Amino acid sequence: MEIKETYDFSSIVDLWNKNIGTVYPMNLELFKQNYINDRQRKKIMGAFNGEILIGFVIYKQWTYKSGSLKPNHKIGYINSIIVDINFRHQGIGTKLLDAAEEELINSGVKILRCGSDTYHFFPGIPLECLPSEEFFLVRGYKMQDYFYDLIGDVSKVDFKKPSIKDGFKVNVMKPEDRKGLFEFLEKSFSGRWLEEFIEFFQVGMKERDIVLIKYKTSVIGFSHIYDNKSSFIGPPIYWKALLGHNYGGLGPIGIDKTYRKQGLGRLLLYESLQILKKREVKKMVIDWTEKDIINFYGRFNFMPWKAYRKATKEVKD
Amino acid sequence: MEIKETYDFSSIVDLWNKNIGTVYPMNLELFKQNYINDRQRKKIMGAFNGEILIGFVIYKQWTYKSGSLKPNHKIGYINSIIVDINFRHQGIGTKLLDAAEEELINSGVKILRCGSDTYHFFPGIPLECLPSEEFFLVRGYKMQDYFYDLIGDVSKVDFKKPSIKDGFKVNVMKPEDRKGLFEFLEKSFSGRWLEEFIEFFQVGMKERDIVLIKYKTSVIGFSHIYDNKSSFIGPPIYWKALLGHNYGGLGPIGIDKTYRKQGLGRLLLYESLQILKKREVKKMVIDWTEKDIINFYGRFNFMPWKAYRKATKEVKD
Ligand SMILES: CC(=O)SCCNC(=O)CCNC(=O)[C@H](O)C(C)(C)COP(=O)(O)OP(=O)(O)OC[C@H]1O[C@@H](n2cnc3c(N)ncnc32)[C@H](O)[C@@H]1OP(=O)(O)O
Ligand SMILES: CC(=O)SCCNC(=O)CCNC(=O)[C@H](O)C(C)(C)COP(=O)(O)OP(=O)(O)OC[C@H]1O[C@@H](n2cnc3c(N)ncnc32)[C@H](O)[C@@H]1OP(=O)(O)O
Ligand SMILES: O=S(=O)(O)CCCN1CCN(CCO)CC1
Ligand SMILES: O=S(=O)(O)CCCN1CCN(CCO)CC1
Ligand SMILES: CC(=O)N[C@@H]1[C@@H](O)[C@H](O)[C@@H](CO)O[C@H]1O
Ligand SMILES: CC(=O)N[C@@H]1[C@@H](O)[C@H](O)[C@@H](CO)O[C@H]1O
Numbered sequence: 217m218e219i220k221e222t223y224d225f226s227s228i229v230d231l232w233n234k235n236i237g238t239v240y241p242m243n244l245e246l247f248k249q250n251y252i253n254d255r256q257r258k259k260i261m262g263a264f265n266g267e268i269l270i271g272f273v274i275y276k277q278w279t280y281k282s283g284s285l286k287p288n289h290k291i292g293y294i295n296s297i298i299v300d301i302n303f304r305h306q307g308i309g310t311k312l313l314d315a316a317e318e319e320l321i322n323s324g325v326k327i328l329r330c331g332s333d334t335y336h337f338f339p340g341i342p343l344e345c346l347p348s349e350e351f352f353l354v355r356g357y358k359m360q361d362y363f364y365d366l367i368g369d370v371s372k373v374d375f376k377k378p379s380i381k382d383g384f385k386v387n388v389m390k391p392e393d394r395k396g397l398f399e400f401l402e403k404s405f406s407g408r409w410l411e412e413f414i415e416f417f418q419v420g421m422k423e424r425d426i427v428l429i430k431y432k433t434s435v436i437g438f439s440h441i442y443d444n445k446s447s448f449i450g451p452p453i454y455w456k457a458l459l460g461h462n463y464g465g466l467g468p469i470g471i472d473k474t475y476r477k478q479g480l481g482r483l484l485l486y487e488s489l490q491i492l493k494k495r496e497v498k499k500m501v502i503d504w505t506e507k508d509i510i511n512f513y514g515r516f517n518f519m520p521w522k523a524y525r526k527a528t529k530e531v532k533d
Numbered sequence: 534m535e536i537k538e539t540y541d542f543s544s545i546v547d548l549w550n551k552n553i554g555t556v557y558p559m560n561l562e563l564f565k566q567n568y569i570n571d572r573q574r575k576k577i578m579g580a581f582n583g584e585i586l587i588g589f590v591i592y593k594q595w596t597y598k599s600g601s602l603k604p605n606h607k608i609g610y611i612n613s614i615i616v617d618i619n620f621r622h623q624g625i626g627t628k629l630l631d632a633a634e635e636e637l638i639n640s641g642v643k644i645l646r647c648g649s650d651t652y653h654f655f656p657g658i659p660l661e662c663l664p665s666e667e668f669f670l671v672r673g674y675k676m677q678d679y680f681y682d683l684i685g686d687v688s689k690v691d692f693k694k695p696s697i698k699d700g701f702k703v704n705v706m707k708p709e710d711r712k713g714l715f716e717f718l719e720k721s722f723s724g725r726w727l728e729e730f731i732e733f734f735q736v737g738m739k740e741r742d743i744v745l746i747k748y749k750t751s752v753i754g755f756s757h758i759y760d761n762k763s764s765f766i767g768p769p770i771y772w773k774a775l776l777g778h779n780y781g782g783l784g785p786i787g788i789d790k791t792y793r794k795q796g797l798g799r800l801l802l803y804e805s806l807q808i809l810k811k812r813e814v815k816k817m818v819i820d821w822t823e824k825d826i827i828n829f830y831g832r833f834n835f836m837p838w839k840a841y842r843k844a845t846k847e848v849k850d
Contacts, residue, residue: 238686238816239836301690301834343660344836346681347828364663369555373618499555511664517618519556519661523840 217270217308219315222262225251227269235298239344240337241457246449250335253419255280256293257323261315263299263308271299273312276333277320283410284402292317292325293333309351317355321531330357330527334408337454339363339504340524352527360526365452366502366513367521370464370493375516378483384436386487389426393435397428400435404472412468416440420447427491429471429484437471437480439488443495451503455522464497467504481512489516534587534625536632539579542568544586552615556661557654558774563766567652570736572597573610574640578632580616580625588616590629593650594637600727601719609634609642610650626668634672638848647674647844651725654771656680656821657841669844677843682769683819683830684838687781687810692833695800701753703804706743710752714745717752721789729785733757737764744808746788746801754788754797756805760812768820772839781814784821798829806833 222228225248232242251260256276263271274295278287294316299309317328330352331338340363341348349359389397401410425446429437442453442465449456452465466488471481492500501521502513510520539545542565549559568577573593580588591612595604611633616626634645647669648655657680658665666676706714718727742763746754759770759782766773769782783805788798809817818838819830827837 234689235834236836237689238684239838302692304832343840344838346824346837347831367555372551372554375619507663514664515621517552519553520663521556521661523660 217311218264219261219311220264222260222264222269222272224262224269228260228262228272231269231272231300232296232298235301236344240342241455243457246454249419249449250337253415254333254335255415256287256334258295259316259319261312263312269300270303271297271308271312273297273316275316275320277323277325280334281411282334282408283414284406285408285411289324290326292320292328293336294328294330295333295335296331296337310355313355317529326531326533328357328529328531331524332526334411336451338524339365340526343523343525349525349527352529355529356532357527357529360528362507363524363526364505364507364510364520365455365522365524366505366510366518367499368502368513368516368518369499370489370517371462371496371498373517375486375489378479378486380483381479383431384429384480384483386427386429386484388491389423389428389438391423393423393428396433396435397426397438400438400472405470409468409470416448416450421450422447427484427488429480429487431475436475437469437484439466439469439484441466441488441492442500443492443497452501454503455501459499459501462496462498464492464495464500466492466500466502482515485513485516534628535581536578536628537581539577539581539586539589541579541586545577545579545589548586548589548617549613549615552618553661557659558772560774563771566736566766567654570732571650571652572732573604573651575612576633576636578629580629586617587620588614588625588629590614590633592633592637594640594642597651598728599651599725600731601723602725602728606641607643609637609645610653611645611647612650612652613648613654627672630672634846643848643850645674645846645848648841649843651728653768655841656682657843660840660842666842666844669846672846673849674844674846677845679824680841680843681822681824681827681837682772682839682841683822683827683835684816685819685830685833685835686816687806687834688779688813688815690834692803692806695796695803697800698796700748701746701797701800703744703746703801705808706740706745706755708740710740710745713750713752714743714755717755717789722787726785726787733765733767738767739764744801744805746797746804748792753792754786754801756783756786756801758783758805758809759817760809760814769818771820772818776816776818779813779815781809781812781817783809783817783819799832802830802833 257279258276260274262269276293278291331340427439456463574596575593577591579586593610595608648657744756773780
């Protein structure tokens with residue numbers, strides 16, 4: 217058995233699907249999109265029996281800015297690790313993660329996170345991979361709180377328009393709105409979401425995918441929406457194979473702090489969903505939510521669908 | 534708004550699907566199977582706006598034996614409660630559960646359980662219904678541990694036959710095995726599983742659905758298996774709409790205590806799965822498992838799919 221780098225994406229994807237594809241169906245388009253476009257220091261290590269891939273780990277170090285947030289080389293990520301089902305409990309996962317962690321640690325990492333990376337597949341350890349929590353515990357990862365993807369079928373329900381407030385309007389973005397959108401994100405959401413806007417527009421996101429809420433002429437909020445015409449495969453539609461025909465998704469969604477708790481997020485969400493409904497969307501996902509916000513979406517008939525556990529290892533000095 | 538009994542199953546099923554059907558798709562066949570065949574004291578209460586059903590609760594008291602286990606009138610169950618999405622936070626769920634609980638309490642109930650009933654839909658409060666945990670907490674239910682349904686696609690993986698032990702053979706049940714199966718269940722699994730065998734054979738379970746493990750001529754274990762030819766819709770295939778073509782399922786599965794921790798459960802599981810694989814089963818479910826046993830099935834490529842929280846209210850004296 218040898219551990220070495222591999223970029224045989226077809227082999228990786230086939231191993232992914234055989235092992236966890238029932239609940240996380242992967243396609244090469246998504247895999248290559250997210251791996252190749254990532255700007256961080258990154259690597260894929262495989263375990264091989266001769267020519268045959270039997271396991272892999274994908275790992276990264278935070279070396280590229282996220283919007284106004286400078287990179288922190290102390291942070292590393294385990295994007296994904298899978299050992300083939302016919303080769304478990306032979307120490308292969310330990311060998312792959314030892315290789316990954318040692319490389320990270322030598323390059324300055326002090327905090328190792330499970331998922332949650334840029335161009336992630338997972339916000340954290342999936343509930344479907346609950347048994348892996350013990351694997352990570354043995355290595356010194358600590359298990360923390362949960363995040364949830366939510367699912368709803370917007371074709372099935374009609375909602376009341378929230379009572380509008382004068383001056384506030386919600387519309388799909390136009391090209392001429394970009395300046396104002398970026399000024400808004402620099403003020404209000406200047407970290408990962410700013411970076412995501414910059415990056416996703418480079419990899420095929422279009423104005424039709426963004427909804428803006430304005431007070432007079434000023435952008436005060438946004439949402440990202442997805443349907444089966446989106447070119448960029450973002451997190452809400454990673455798992456679109458599970459979602460049937462006319463899938464869709466929403467997220468992120470944000471309102472300027474000084475405008476919060478006035479009904480404007482509800483208005484933004486309502487209008488965004490109406491856009492998707494009119495686009496003939498059926499099942500759709502809201503990704504990577506915290507427990508305390510679920511009921512905001514639950515009012516629109518969304519339910520927790522997938523759960524992920526945050527987990528972090530502090531490198532011993 | 535009025536609360537009264539309703540047995541308009543089509544209306545109930547339509548409300549179920551509109552509200553939670555994305556993740557718990559209900560069909561009338563299953564609904565009627567499980568409601569009508571249940572032997573406990575049972576009722577369905579609906580909330581109505583005139584002729585229109587806007588919510589329901591299904592509830593039961595333990596009044597009929599489970600195998601050798603006598604009924605305990607102190608135990609009541611909330612089988613399911615759903616308020617329509619357009620009528621939430623108006624007190625309707627409180628009114629339905631107040632009606633149910635008061636009836637139960639007057640008839641002697643001291644312990645109220647969320648799900649886990651005979652002919653249940655849910656082992657406990659589904660993770661997809663996590664927000665309802667707060668609804669039940671306000672009423673004095675306490676949240677306990679979790680159970681999991683597991684999912685696997687048996688068409689995708691080949692396993693090694695476990696090393697057989699002489700004298701032990703695994704085969705689909707024949708009609709002439711029934712006596713020995715029931716003597717075995719009376720000795721080893723004489724509660725709910727015994728009752729389920731008795732009842733499920735009345736409602737369409739067939740010998741082809743049962744696998745037996747024998748030591749010489751003596752039954753020492755069994756499993757229940759399901760495919761798209763099963764007549765009885767048991768828990769592993771409740772949610773078969775999510776499972777695609779050639780769905781299946783397994784559970785329960787049990788070995789005589791004195792024969793445990795010798796490899797025989799693994800052998801039983803392997804052979805049961807080989808039966809399903811040869812029947813051309815693809816995605817299949819193992820229902821209502823405890824965390825400590827997941828890895829037993831995980832070796833065969835099964836992963837947690839759905840999670841449910843046990844919850845119980847102790848009636849204040
Ligand atoms: C950020 C993320 O990627 S989260 C998703 C993680 N990946 C998955 O869950 C995919 C499915 N699972 C797998 O691919 C594997 O089970 C892995 C990668 C978790 C572990 O790979 P393996 O090669 O089997 O692990 P390895 O043999 O090195 O395990 C070492 C120790 O970890 C612990 N461990 C590993 N798997 C488990 C498990 N399922 N349950 C409990 N402990 C375990 C044990 O202590 C084990 O030692 P043991 O064999 O003496 O019991
Ligand atoms: C055994 C089982 O059936 S488990 C599955 C339970 N059912 C579901 O989850 C289906 C989907 N949900 C529903 O149908 C509803 O949300 C129900 C049945 C849980 C509650 O119905 P409602 O009519 O909205 O509840 P009702 O208005 O009586 O709620 C009373 C109090 O419960 C608490 N509560 C109810 N819903 C929630 C929620 N989503 N989050 C937090 N607390 C809540 C609140 O304290 C609420 O008072 P409030 O309105 O002042 O905040
Ligand atoms: O772009 S910003 O980093 O300034 C704003 C980030 C806000 N959210 C990031 C991801 N989480 C995940 C949980 O929903 C919530 C907060
Ligand atoms: O039929 S018996 O009641 O004697 C045996 C019951 C055994 N199991 C019942 C249901 N649970 C649920 C968790 O898997 C496990 C124990
Ligand atoms: C509902 C929501 O806003 N969720 C977003 C998610 O869409 C996004 O993929 C992630 C990472 O940027 O940040 C979460 O907070
Ligand atoms: C894997 C397993 O045995 N799970 C069974 C389940 O199949 C059955 O529906 C339930 C209620 O009898 O009891 C569980 O213990």
